[PDB]
Amino acid sequence: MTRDQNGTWEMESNENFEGYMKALDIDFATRKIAVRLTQTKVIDQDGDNFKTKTTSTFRNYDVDFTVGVEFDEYTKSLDNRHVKALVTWEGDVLVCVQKGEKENRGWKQWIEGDKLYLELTCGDQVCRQVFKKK
Ligand SMILES: CCCCC/C=C\C/C=C\C/C=C\C/C=C\CCCC(=O)OC[C@@H](O)CO
């Protein structure tokens, strides 16, 4: 029983964020800034209802969802695309499929020990982030 992801989480590693952003067609100048940054993630979770806020000195991104309920997601200030998003549980892993113009786009987020893991996929690029609880 490790579905409770509530907390404030600080990034400690961010593997292949450059490749993930390139797969999303983020321009070089934006990648140059974004790859430098430590992200913070605040998760407010009530059962299957999630409110998430990911922050940095350069851009912030909020996404709220209920597990099992498809929603329209606009990735404002990231790659600025519209997708249909669905988050489901696979065991205690949150799995999101973002259906839209990019093939094989989604993410998976789970608790393991005292860490939050987030793997973001776009095409053949996977970015693996690890966060430690504040
Ligand atoms: C927002 C801080 C990073 C900004 C970097 C600025 C520009 C880079 C442009 C595009 C890169 C694409 C995505 C950024 C990566 C992670 C932010 C969270 C994405 C997400 O939905 O979290 C999954 C899940 O945690 C949400 O609940």
Whether 133 and 9 have beta carbons less than 8 Å apart is answered as yes
Reduce the DSSP state of residue 21 to 3 states and report it: helix
Vertex 57: Cα angle to 62 and 30 (nearest 5): 85
C-alpha 15/C-alpha 58 separation (Å) is: 19
Distance from residue 102's CA to the centre of ligand 1 (Å): 16
Whether 130 and 11 have beta carbons less than 8 Å apart is answered as yes
Ligand 1 pocket list (CB less than 6 A): 21, 24, 26, 30, 34, 39, 41, 52, 54, 56, 58-61, 63, 78-79, 107, 109, 118, 120
User: Which residue's alpha carbon is at the smallest distance from atom 9 of ligand 1?
Assistant: 78
Tokens in use for 23? 């797969």
List the domain boundaries for the chain.
1-134
C-alpha 3/C-alpha 33 separation (Å) is: 33
Distance from residue 78's CA to the centre of ligand 1 (Å): 7
Tokens in use for 7? 């907390």
User: Which residue's alpha carbon is at the smallest distance from atom 27 of ligand 1?
Assistant: 52
Tokens in use for 42? 């605040």
Whether 8 and 114 have beta carbons less than 8 Å apart is answered as no
- Rounded to the nearest 5°, which phi and psi values hold at 41? -130, 125
Residue 109 annotated as binding site: yes
Contacts of 88 (CB under 8 A, 6+ apart): 67, 68, 94, 95, 96
Q: For tokens 């793997």, what's the residue?
A: 119
> Could you count the other beta carbons within 10 Å of the beta carbon of residue 12?
11
Tell me the resolution in Å: 1.4
Residue 129 annotated as binding site: no
Say how far residue 3 (Cα) sits from the centre of its chain.
Answer: 16
> Could you count the other beta carbons within 10 Å of the beta carbon of residue 50?
19
Residues in the chain: 134
Contacts of 70 (CB under 8 A, 6+ apart): 84, 85, 86
- Rounded to the nearest 5°, which phi and psi values hold at 22? -65, -40
Whether 2 and 117 have beta carbons less than 8 Å apart is answered as no
